[PDB]
Coordinates of C-alpha atoms and ligand atoms in Angstrom, one line a residue:
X4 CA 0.0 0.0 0.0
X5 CA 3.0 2.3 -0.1
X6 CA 3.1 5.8 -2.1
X7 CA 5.7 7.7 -3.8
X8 CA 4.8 11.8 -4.1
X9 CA 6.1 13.7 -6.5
X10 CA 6.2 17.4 -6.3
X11 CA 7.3 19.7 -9.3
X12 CA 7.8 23.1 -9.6
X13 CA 7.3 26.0 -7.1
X14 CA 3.6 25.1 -6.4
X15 CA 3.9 21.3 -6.5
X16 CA 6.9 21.7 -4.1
X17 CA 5.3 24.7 -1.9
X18 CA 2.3 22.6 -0.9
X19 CA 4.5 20.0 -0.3
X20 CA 5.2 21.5 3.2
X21 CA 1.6 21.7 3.9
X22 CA 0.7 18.1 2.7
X23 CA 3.6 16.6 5.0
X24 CA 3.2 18.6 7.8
X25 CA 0.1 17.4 8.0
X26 CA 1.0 13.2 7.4
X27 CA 3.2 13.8 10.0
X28 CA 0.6 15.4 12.4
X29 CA -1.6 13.1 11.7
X30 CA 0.9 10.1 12.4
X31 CA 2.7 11.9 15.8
X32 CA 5.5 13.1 14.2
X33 CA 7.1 17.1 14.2
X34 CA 8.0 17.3 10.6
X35 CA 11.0 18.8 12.0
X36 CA 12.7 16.4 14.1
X37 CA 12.0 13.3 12.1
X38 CA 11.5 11.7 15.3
X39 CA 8.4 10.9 17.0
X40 CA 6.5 12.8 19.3
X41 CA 4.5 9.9 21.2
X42 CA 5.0 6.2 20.1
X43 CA 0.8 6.3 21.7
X44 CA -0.2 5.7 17.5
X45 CA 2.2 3.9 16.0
X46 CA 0.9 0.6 17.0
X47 CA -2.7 1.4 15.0
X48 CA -0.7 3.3 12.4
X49 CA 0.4 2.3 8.8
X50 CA 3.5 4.8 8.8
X51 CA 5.1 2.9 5.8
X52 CA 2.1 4.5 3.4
X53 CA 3.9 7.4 3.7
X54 CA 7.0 7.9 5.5
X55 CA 10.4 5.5 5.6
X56 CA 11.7 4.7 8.9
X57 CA 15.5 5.4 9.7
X58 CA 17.0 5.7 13.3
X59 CA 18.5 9.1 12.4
X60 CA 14.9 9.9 11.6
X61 CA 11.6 9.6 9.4
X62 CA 12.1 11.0 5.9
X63 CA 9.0 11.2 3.2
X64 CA 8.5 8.8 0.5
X65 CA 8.7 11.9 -2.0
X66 CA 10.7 13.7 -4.6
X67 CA 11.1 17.6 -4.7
X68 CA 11.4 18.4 -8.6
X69 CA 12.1 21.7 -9.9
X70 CA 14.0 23.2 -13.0
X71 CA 14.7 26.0 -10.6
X72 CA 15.9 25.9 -7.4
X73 CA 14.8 29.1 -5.2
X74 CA 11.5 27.7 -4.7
X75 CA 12.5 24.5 -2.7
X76 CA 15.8 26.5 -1.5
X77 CA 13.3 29.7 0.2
X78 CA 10.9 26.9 1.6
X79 CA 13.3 24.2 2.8
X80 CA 15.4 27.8 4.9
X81 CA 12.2 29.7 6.4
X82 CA 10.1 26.7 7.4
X83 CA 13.8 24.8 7.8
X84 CA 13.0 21.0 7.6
X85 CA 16.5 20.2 6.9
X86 CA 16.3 16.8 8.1
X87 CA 12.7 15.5 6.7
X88 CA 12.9 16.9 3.0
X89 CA 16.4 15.7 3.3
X90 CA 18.2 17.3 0.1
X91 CA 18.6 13.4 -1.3
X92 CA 15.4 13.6 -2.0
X93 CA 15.5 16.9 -4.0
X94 CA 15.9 16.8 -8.1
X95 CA 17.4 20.3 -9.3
X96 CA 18.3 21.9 -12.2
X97 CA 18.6 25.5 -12.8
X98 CA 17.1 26.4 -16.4
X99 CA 13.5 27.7 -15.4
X100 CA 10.8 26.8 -17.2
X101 CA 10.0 30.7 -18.1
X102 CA 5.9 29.8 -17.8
X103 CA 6.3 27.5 -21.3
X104 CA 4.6 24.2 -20.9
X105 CA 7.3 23.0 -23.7
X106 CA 10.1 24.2 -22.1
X107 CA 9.4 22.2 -18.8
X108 CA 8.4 19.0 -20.8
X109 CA 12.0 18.5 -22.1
X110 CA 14.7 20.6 -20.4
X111 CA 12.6 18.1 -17.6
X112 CA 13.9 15.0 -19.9
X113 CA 17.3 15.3 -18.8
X114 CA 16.3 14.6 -15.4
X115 CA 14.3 11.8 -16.0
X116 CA 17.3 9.1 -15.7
X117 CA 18.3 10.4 -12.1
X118 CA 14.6 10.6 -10.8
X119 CA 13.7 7.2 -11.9
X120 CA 16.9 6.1 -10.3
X121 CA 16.1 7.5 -7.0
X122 CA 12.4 6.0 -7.7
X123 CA 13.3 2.4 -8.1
X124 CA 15.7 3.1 -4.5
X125 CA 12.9 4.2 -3.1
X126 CA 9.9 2.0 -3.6
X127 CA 9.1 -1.4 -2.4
X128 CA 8.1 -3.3 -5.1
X129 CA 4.8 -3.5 -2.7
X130 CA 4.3 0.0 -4.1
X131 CA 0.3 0.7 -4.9
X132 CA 1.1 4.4 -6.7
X133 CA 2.3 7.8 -7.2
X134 CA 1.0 11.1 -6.3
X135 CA 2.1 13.8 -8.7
X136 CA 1.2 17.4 -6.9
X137 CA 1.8 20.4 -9.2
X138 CA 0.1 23.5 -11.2
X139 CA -0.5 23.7 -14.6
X140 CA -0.4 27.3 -15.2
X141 CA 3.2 27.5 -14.8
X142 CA 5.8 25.9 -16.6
X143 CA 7.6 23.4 -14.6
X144 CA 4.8 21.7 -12.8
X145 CA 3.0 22.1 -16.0
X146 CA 5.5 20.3 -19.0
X147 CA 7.4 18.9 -16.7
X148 CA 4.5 17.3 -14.4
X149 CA 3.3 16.3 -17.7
X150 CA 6.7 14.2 -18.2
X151 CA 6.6 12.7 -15.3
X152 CA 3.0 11.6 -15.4
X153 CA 3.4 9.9 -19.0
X154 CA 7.0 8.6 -17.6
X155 CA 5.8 6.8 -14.4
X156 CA 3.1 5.2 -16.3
X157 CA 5.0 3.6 -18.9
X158 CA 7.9 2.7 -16.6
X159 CA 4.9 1.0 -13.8
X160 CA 2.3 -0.2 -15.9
X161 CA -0.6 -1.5 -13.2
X162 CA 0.5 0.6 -10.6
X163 CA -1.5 4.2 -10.4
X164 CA -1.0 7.5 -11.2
X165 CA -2.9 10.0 -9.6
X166 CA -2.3 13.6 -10.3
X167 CA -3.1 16.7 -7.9
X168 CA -2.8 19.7 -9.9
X169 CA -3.8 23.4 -9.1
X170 CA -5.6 25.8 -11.9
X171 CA -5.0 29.2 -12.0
X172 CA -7.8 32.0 -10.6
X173 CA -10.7 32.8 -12.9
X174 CA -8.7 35.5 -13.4
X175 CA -5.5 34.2 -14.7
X176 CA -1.9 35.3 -13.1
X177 CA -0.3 34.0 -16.2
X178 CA -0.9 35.1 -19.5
X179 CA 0.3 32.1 -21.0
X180 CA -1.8 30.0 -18.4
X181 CA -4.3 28.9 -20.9
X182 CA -1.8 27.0 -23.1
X183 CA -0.2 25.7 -20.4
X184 CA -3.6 24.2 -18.8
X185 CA -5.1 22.7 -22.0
X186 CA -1.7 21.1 -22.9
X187 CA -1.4 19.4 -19.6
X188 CA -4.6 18.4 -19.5
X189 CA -4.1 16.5 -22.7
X190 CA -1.2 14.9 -21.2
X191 CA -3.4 13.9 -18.1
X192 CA -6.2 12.4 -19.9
X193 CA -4.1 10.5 -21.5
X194 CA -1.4 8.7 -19.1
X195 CA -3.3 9.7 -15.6
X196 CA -5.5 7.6 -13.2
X197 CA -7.3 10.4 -11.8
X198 CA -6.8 14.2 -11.7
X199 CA -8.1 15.8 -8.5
X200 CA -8.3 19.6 -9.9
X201 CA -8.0 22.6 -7.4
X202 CA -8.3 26.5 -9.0
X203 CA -6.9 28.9 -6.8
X204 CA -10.0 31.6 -7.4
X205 CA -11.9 28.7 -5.2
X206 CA -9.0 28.2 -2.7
X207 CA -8.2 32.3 -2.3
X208 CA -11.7 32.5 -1.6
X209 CA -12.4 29.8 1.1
X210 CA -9.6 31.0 3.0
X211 CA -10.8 34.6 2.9
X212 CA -14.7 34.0 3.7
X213 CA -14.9 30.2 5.6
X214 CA -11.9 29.8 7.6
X215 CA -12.0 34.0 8.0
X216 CA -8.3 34.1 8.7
X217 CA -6.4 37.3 10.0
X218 CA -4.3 37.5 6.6
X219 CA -2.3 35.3 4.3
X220 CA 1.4 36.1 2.7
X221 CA 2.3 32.7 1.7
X222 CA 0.5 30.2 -0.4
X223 CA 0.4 28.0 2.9
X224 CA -3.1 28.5 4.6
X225 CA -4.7 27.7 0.7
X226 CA -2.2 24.6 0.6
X227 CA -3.5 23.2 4.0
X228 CA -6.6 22.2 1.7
X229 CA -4.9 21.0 -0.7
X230 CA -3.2 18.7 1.9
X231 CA -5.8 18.4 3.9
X232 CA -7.5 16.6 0.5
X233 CA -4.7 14.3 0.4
X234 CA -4.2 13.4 3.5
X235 CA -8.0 12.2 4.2
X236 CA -8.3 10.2 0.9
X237 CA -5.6 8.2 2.4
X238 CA -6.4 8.0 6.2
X239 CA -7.6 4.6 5.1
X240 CA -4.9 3.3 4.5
X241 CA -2.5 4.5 7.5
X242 CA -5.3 3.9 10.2
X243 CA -8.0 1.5 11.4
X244 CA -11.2 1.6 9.7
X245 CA -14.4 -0.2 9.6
X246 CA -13.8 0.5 5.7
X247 CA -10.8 1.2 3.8
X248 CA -10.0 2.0 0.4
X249 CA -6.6 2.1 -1.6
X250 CA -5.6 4.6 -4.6
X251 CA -7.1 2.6 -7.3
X252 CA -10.1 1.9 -5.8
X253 CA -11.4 5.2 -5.6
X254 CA -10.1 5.8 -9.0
X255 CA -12.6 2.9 -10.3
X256 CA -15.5 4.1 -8.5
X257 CA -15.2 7.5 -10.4
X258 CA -14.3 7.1 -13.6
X259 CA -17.4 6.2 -15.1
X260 CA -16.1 6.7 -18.9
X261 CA -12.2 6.2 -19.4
X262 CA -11.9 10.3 -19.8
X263 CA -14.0 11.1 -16.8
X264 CA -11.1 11.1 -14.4
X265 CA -11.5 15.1 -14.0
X266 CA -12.8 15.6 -10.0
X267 CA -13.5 18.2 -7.6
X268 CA -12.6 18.0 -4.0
X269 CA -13.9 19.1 -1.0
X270 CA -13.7 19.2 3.0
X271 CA -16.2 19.4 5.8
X272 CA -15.0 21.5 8.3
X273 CA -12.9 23.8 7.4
X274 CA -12.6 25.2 10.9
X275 CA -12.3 23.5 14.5
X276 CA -15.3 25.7 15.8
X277 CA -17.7 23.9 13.3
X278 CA -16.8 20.7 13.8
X279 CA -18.6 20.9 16.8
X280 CA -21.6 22.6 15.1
X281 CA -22.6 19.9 12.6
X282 CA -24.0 16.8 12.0
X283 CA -23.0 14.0 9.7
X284 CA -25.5 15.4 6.9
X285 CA -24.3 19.1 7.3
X286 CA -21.1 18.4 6.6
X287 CA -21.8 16.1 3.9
X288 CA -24.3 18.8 2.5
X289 CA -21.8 21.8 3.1
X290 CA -19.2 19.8 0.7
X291 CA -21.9 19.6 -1.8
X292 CA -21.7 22.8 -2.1
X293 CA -19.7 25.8 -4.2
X294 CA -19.0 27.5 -1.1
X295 CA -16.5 24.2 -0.2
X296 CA -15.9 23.3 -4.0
X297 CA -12.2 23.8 -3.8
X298 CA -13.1 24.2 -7.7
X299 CA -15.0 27.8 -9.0
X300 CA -18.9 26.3 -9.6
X301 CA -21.8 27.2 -10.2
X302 CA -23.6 25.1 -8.5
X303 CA -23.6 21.6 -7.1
X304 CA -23.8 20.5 -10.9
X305 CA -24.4 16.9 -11.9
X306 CA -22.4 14.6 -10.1
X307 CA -21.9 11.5 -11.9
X308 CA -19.8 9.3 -9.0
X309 CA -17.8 10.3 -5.6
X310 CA -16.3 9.4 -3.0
X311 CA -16.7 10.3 0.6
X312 CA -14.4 10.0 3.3
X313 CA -15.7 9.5 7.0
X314 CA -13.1 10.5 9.8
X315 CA -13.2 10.8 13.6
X316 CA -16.6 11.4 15.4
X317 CA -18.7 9.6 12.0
X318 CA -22.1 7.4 13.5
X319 CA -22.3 4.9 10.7
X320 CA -25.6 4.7 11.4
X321 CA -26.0 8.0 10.6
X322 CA -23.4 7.8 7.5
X323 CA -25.6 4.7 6.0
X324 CA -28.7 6.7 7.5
X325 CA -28.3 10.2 5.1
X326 CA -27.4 8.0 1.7
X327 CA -31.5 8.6 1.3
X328 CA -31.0 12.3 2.3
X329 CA -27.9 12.7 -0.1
X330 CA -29.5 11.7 -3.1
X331 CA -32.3 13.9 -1.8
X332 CA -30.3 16.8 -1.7
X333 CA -27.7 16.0 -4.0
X334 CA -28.7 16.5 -7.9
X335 CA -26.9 13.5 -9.8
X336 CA -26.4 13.3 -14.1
X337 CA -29.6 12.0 -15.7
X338 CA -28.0 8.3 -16.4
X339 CA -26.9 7.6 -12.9
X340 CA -29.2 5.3 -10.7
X341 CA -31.2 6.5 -7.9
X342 CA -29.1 3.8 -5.6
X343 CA -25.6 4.5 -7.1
X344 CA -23.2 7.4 -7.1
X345 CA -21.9 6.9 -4.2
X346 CA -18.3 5.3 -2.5
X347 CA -17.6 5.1 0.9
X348 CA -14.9 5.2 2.9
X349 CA -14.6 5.1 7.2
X350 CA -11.3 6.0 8.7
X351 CA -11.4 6.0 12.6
X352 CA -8.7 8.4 13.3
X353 CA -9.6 12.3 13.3
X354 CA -8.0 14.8 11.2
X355 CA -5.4 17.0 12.6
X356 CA -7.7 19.9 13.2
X357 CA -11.1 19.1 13.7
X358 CA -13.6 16.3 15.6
X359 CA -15.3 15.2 12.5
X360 CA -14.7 15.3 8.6
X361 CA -16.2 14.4 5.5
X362 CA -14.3 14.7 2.2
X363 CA -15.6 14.5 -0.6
X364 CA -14.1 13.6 -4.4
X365 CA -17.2 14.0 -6.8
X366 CA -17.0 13.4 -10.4
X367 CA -19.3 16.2 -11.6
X368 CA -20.3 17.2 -14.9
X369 CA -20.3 21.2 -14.4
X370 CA -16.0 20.6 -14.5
X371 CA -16.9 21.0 -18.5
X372 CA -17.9 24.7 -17.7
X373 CA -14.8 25.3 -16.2
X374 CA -13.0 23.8 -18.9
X375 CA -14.9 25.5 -21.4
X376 CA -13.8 29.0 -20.0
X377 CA -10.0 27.8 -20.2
X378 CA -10.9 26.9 -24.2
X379 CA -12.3 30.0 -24.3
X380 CA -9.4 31.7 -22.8
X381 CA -6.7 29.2 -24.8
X382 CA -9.1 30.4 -27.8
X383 CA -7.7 34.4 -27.5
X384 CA -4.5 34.0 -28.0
X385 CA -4.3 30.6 -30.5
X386 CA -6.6 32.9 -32.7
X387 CA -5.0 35.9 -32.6
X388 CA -1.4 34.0 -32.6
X389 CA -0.4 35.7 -29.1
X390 CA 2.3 34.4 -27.3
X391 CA 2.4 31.0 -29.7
X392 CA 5.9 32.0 -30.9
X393 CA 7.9 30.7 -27.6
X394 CA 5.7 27.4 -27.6
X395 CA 6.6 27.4 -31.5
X396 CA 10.0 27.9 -31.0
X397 CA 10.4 25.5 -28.1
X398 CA 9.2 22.8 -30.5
X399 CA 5.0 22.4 -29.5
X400 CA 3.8 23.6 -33.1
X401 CA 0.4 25.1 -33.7
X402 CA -0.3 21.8 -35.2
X403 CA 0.3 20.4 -32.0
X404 CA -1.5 22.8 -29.4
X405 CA -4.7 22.8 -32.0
X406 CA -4.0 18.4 -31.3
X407 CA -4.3 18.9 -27.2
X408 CA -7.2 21.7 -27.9
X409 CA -9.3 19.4 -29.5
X410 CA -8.7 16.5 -27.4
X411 CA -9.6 19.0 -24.5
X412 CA -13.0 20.0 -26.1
X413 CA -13.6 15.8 -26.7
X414 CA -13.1 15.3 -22.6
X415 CA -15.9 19.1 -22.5
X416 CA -18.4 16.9 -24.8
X417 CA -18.4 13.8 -23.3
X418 CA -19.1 15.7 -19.3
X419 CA -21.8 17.5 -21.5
X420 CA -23.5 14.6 -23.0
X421 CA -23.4 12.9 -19.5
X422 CA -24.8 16.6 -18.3
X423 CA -27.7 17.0 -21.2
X424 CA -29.6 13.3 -21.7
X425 CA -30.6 14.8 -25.4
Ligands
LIG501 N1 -2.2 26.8 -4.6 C1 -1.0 27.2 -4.9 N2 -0.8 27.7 -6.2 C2 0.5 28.1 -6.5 C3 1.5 28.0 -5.6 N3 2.7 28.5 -6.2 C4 2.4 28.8 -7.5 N4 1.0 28.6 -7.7 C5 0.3 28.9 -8.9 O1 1.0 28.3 -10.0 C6 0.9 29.1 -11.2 C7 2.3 29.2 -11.8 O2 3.0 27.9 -11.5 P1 4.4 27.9 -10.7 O3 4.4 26.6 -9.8 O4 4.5 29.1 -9.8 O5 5.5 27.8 -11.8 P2 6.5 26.5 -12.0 O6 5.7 25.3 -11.9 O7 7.6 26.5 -11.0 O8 7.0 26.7 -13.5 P3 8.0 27.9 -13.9 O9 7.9 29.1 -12.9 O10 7.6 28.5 -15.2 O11 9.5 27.5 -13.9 C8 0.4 30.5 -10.8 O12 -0.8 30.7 -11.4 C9 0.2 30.4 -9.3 O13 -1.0 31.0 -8.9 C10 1.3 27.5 -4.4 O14 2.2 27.4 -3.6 N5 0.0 27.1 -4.0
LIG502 NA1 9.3 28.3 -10.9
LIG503 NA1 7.8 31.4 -11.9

């Protein structure tokens, strides 16, 4: 059941601090020290999902990728976990990506020898997966995510890929964000297991209105739920449960067609001082919601499958009680039975932060709307030829970003035609 993460670029390896911190909470463990704080969990813990064991101390089954190295240098000196992301671990170059998808895909190349090296060190051959965390509207984390996700699943057949991967706001920071998203996407389609999409404009704005906090500097407090997503999928697997579920299982309850593998993700609480305040139902309701839609949604949409992840203070009764109720409340695609749609999941052990939680991967068809506005954006510059030239002249032709647009528009039709029953 053991997992290797990969995290590439600044995003993929900035979240990284959140996602660990937050495995080693969860397991006892100050990221810091390696060591353990209690050995009181240990004994009804799975630490090998995650972490390796060493005497000097506990170091993450990961990689830290990047074609530039301030990103992991800044993060790896402020927050200073010296001895957990333990510099073996850490893939360098010092090229940039410059925000070019193409650019990342192959100066990335040259790495791939010395990353598969330290990958076949690093795994048992009991390995279930990878976890490849990054953002697509960069370059690195783009092209060379990209890389990595085509790579790993040609070098592991059978064994699963599952991608985290971070849009940009509605409002893009990059300009050349809209090339970069469409082209990794095709890549994703293609080579991933399942793609667990977050979009910052979603993040920004649960962090300012739900969790209400003072103020935010650093991409960490909109990371926590990114990690927080991760690390609750998985609780499963790393602690007792009256019903656990591995990487590919999830995967096969979702994907309903082979290009359905596009979710949204979501967590119930987001603060301590609710966790007291609900119910099983409210917080299973609440992430059925755009206000928790770590995605920007309309509405619920059309869900077509999900998952949901019990954790902590969870009544089973109650869980199995509200599967009437959720259907009630939840609006599902026209083709999907009044009796399925659903996939659960019990972990015993409570998050780091709160008494109860629910998350919640859904497979919902309103992801083609926020597609469609990336088209539409990718459409603004491939028609007016802005910005094409670097991606020309880092070898992705027109030929071949109109090849990844129309694939892109494919994946929109077929969430559309699961959406529309006409
Ligand atoms: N949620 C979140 N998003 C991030 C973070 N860092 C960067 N981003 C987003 O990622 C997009 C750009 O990707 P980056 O990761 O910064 O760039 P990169 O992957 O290192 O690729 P290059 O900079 O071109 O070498 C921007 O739209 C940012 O909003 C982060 O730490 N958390
Ligand atoms: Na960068
Ligand atoms: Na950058």
């Amino acid at each position: 059941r053991e997992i290797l993460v990969l995290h590439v670029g600044q995003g993929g390896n900035q979240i990284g601090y959140n996602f660990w911190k937050t495995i080693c909470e969860e397991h006892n463990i100050d990221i810091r020290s390696n060591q353990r704080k209690s050995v009181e969990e240990d004994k009804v813990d799975y630490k090998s999902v995650f972490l390796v064991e060493a005497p000097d101390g506990f170091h993450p089954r990961a990689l830290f990728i990047d074609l530039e190295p301030l990103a992991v240098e800044f993060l790896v000196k402020e927050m200073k976990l010296g001895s957990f992301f333990s510099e073996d671990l850490m893939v360098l170059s010092y090229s940039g990506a410059h925000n070019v998808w193409s650019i990342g895909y192959q100066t990335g190349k040259k790495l791939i020898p010395v990353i598969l090296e330290k990958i076949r060190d690093t795994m048992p051959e009991t390995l279930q997966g990878f976890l490849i965390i990054h953002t697509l509207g960069g370059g690195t984390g783009s092209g060379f995510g990209s890389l990595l996700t085509e790579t790993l699943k040609k070098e592991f057949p059978g064994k699963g890929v599952l991608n985290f991967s971070v849009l940009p706001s509605e409002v893009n920071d990059v300009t050349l964000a809209p090339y970069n998203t469409v082209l990794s996407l095709n890549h994703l389609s293609r080579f991933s297991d399942l793609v667990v999409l977050f979009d910052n404009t979603a993040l920004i704005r649960i962090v300012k209105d739900q969790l209400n906090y003072p103020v935010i500097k650093q991409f960490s407090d909109l990371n926590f739920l990114i990690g927080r997503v991760m690390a609750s999928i998985t609780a499963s697997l790393r602690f007792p449960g009256p019903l656990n579920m591995d990487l590919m299982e999830m995967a096969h309850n979702l994907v309903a067609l082979p290009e359905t593998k596009f979710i949204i993700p979501s967590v119930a609480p987001l603060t301590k001082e609710e966790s007291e305040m609900s119910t099983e139902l409210d917080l299973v309701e609440r992430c059925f919601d755009p206000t928790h839609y770590m995605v920007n949604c309309s509405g619920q949409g059309k869900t077509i499958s999900s998952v949901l992840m019990f954790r902590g203070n969870i009544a089973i009764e109650n869980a199995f009680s509200i599967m009437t109720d959720i259907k009630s409340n939840v609006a599902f695609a026209p083709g999907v039975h009044p009796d399925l749609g659903l996939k659960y999941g019990i972990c015993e052990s409570a998050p780091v932060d709160f008494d109860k939680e629910v998350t919640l991967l859904s497979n919902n068809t309103i992801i083609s709307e926020v597609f469609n506005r990336v088209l539409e954006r990718f459409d603004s510059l491939f028609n007016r030829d802005w910005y094409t030239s670097d991606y020309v002249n880092a070898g992705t032709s027109k030929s071949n970003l109109k090849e990844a647009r129309d694939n892109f528009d494919r994946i929109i039709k077929i969430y559309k035609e699961i959406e529309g029953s006409q």
